[PDB]
UniProtKB/Swiss-Prot annotation:
<feature type="topological domain" description="Extracellular">
    <location>
        <begin position="152"/>
        <end position="284"/>
    </location>
</feature>
<feature type="binding site">
    <location>
        <position position="221"/>
    </location>
    <ligand>
        <name>glycine</name>
    </ligand>
</feature>
<feature type="glycosylation site" description="N-linked (GlcNAc...) asparagine">
    <location>
        <position position="262"/>
    </location>
</feature>
<feature type="binding site">
    <location>
        <position position="127"/>
    </location>
    <ligand>
        <name>glycine</name>
    </ligand>
</feature>
<feature type="binding site">
    <location>
        <position position="221"/>
    </location>
    <ligand>
        <name>D-serine</name>
    </ligand>
</feature>
<feature type="binding site">
    <location>
        <position position="177"/>
    </location>
    <ligand>
        <name>D-serine</name>
    </ligand>
</feature>
<comment type="subunit">
    <text>Heterotetramer. Forms heterotetrameric channels composed of two GluN1/zeta subunits (GRIN1), and two identical GluN3 subunits (GRIN3A or GRIN3B) (in vitro). Can also form heterotetrameric channels that contain at least two GluN1 subunits and at least a combination of one GluN2 and one GluN3 subunits (in vitro). Does not form functional homomeric channels. Found in a complex with GRIN1, GRIN2A or GRIN2B and PPP2CB. Probably interacts with PPP2CB. No complex with PPP2CB is detected when NMDARs are stimulated by NMDA.</text>
</comment>
<feature type="binding site">
    <location>
        <position position="178"/>
    </location>
    <ligand>
        <name>D-serine</name>
    </ligand>
</feature>
<feature type="disulfide bond">
    <location>
        <begin position="26"/>
        <end position="64"/>
    </location>
</feature>
<feature type="binding site">
    <location>
        <position position="120"/>
    </location>
    <ligand>
        <name>glycine</name>
    </ligand>
</feature>
<feature type="glycosylation site" description="N-linked (GlcNAc...) asparagine">
    <location>
        <position position="38"/>
    </location>
</feature>
<feature type="binding site">
    <location>
        <position position="177"/>
    </location>
    <ligand>
        <name>glycine</name>
    </ligand>
</feature>
<feature type="binding site">
    <location>
        <position position="127"/>
    </location>
    <ligand>
        <name>D-serine</name>
    </ligand>
</feature>
<comment type="similarity">
    <text>Belongs to the glutamate-gated ion channel (TC 1.A.10.1) family. NR3A/GRIN3A subfamily.</text>
</comment>
<protein>
    <recommendedName>
        <fullName>Glutamate receptor ionotropic, NMDA 3A</fullName>
    </recommendedName>
</protein>
<feature type="binding site">
    <location>
        <position position="122"/>
    </location>
    <ligand>
        <name>D-serine</name>
    </ligand>
</feature>
<feature type="binding site">
    <location>
        <position position="122"/>
    </location>
    <ligand>
        <name>glycine</name>
    </ligand>
</feature>
């Protein structure tokens, strides 16, 4: 029985968090930590405490994690016969190459702080050079969220994005695969966006959707934007334009991990036996 430390990132509907219940448990999820650290020794120490009868973990660090990726992770743990500790990535980022290192989930895999990363994690070329990805369990285009009767765009090649009018505000999530795509394909656009990019997907959605409006368009994974559109009560949001930058979501492991093939096998079986469809129906 292997024991894996798993890093995740809260992104609806793939992973959500809520507080633990009265008896310190998670009847409909998995106990996780939200410790704001990338120090492997601190995590060891915290999970050691969490498992003991002398649990002195600050409550501010304890959460219940639930969602599509947590259901996936539980099934993998049962089929591969491993148990796991689960924590939320300290910097809240998926990961990018910045100032000579990798940040976010990619960084924790490369430092050995996490054994595996499970969330809506995009497989792209740059990350593929440094970490392993399993077979994908989901696929998504990038998308562009706007208000109804608001900004209209043809897709990522719209001149409004490339020769922006004064005060036209559009951004993406910092240190995501969407930022890496814009940075590598449209350097001048990437520069323009810097002042408008946001730390996390919910921030971009809030800035576009809520008043006072802070963004005119928000670019991020279409699967995530479509979820927000589907729960839009006032039906005042939409996604626009042609597809672009289609990527799979995969589980991340260190390069050349011996676990990758076994997890890929299971993901492929889950897909071919309708489990992905069940998870999609459950969470979307
Ligand atoms: Br729960
Ligand atoms: Cl897929
Ligand atoms: Cl209307
Ligand atoms: Cl940030």
């Amino acid at each position: 029985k292997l024991h894996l430390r798993v890093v995740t990132l809260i992104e609806h509907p793939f992973v959500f968090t809520r507080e633990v219940d009265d008896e310190g448990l998670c009847p409909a999820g998995q106990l996780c930590l939200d410790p704001m650290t990338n120090d492997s020794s601190m995590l060891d120490r915290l999970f050691s405490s969490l498992h003991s009868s002398n649990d002195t973990v600050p409550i501010k660090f304890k959460k219940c994690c639930y969602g599509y990726c947590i259901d996936l992770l539980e099934q993998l743990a049962e089929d591969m016969n491993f148990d796991f500790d689960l924590y939320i990535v300290g910097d809240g980022k998926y990961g990018a190459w910045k100032n000579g290192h990798w940040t976010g989930l990619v960084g924790d895999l490369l430092s050995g702080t996490a054994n595996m990363a499970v969330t809506s994690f995009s497989i792209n070329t740059a990350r593929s050079q440094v970490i392993d990805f399993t077979s994908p369990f989901f696929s998504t285009s990038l998308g562009i969220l706007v208000r109804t009767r608001g900004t209209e765009l043809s897709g990522i090649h719209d001149p409004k994005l490339h020769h922006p009018s004064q005060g036209f505000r559009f951004g993406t999530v910092r240190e995501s695969s969407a930022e890496d795509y814009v940075r590598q394909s449209f350097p001048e656009m990437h520069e323009y966006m810097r002042r408008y990019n946001v730390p996390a997907t919910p921030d971009g959605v809030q800035y576009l959707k809520n008043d006072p409006e802070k963004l005119d368009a928000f670019i991020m994974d279409k699967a995530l934007l479509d979820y927000e559109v589907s729960i839009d009560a006032d039906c005042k949001l939409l996604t626009v334009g042609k597809p672009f930058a289609i990527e799979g979501y995969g589980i991340g492991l260190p390069p050349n991990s011996p676990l990758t093939s076994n997890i890929s096998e299971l993901i492929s079986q889950y897909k071919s036996h309708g489990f992905m469809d069940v998870l999609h129906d459950k969470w979307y």
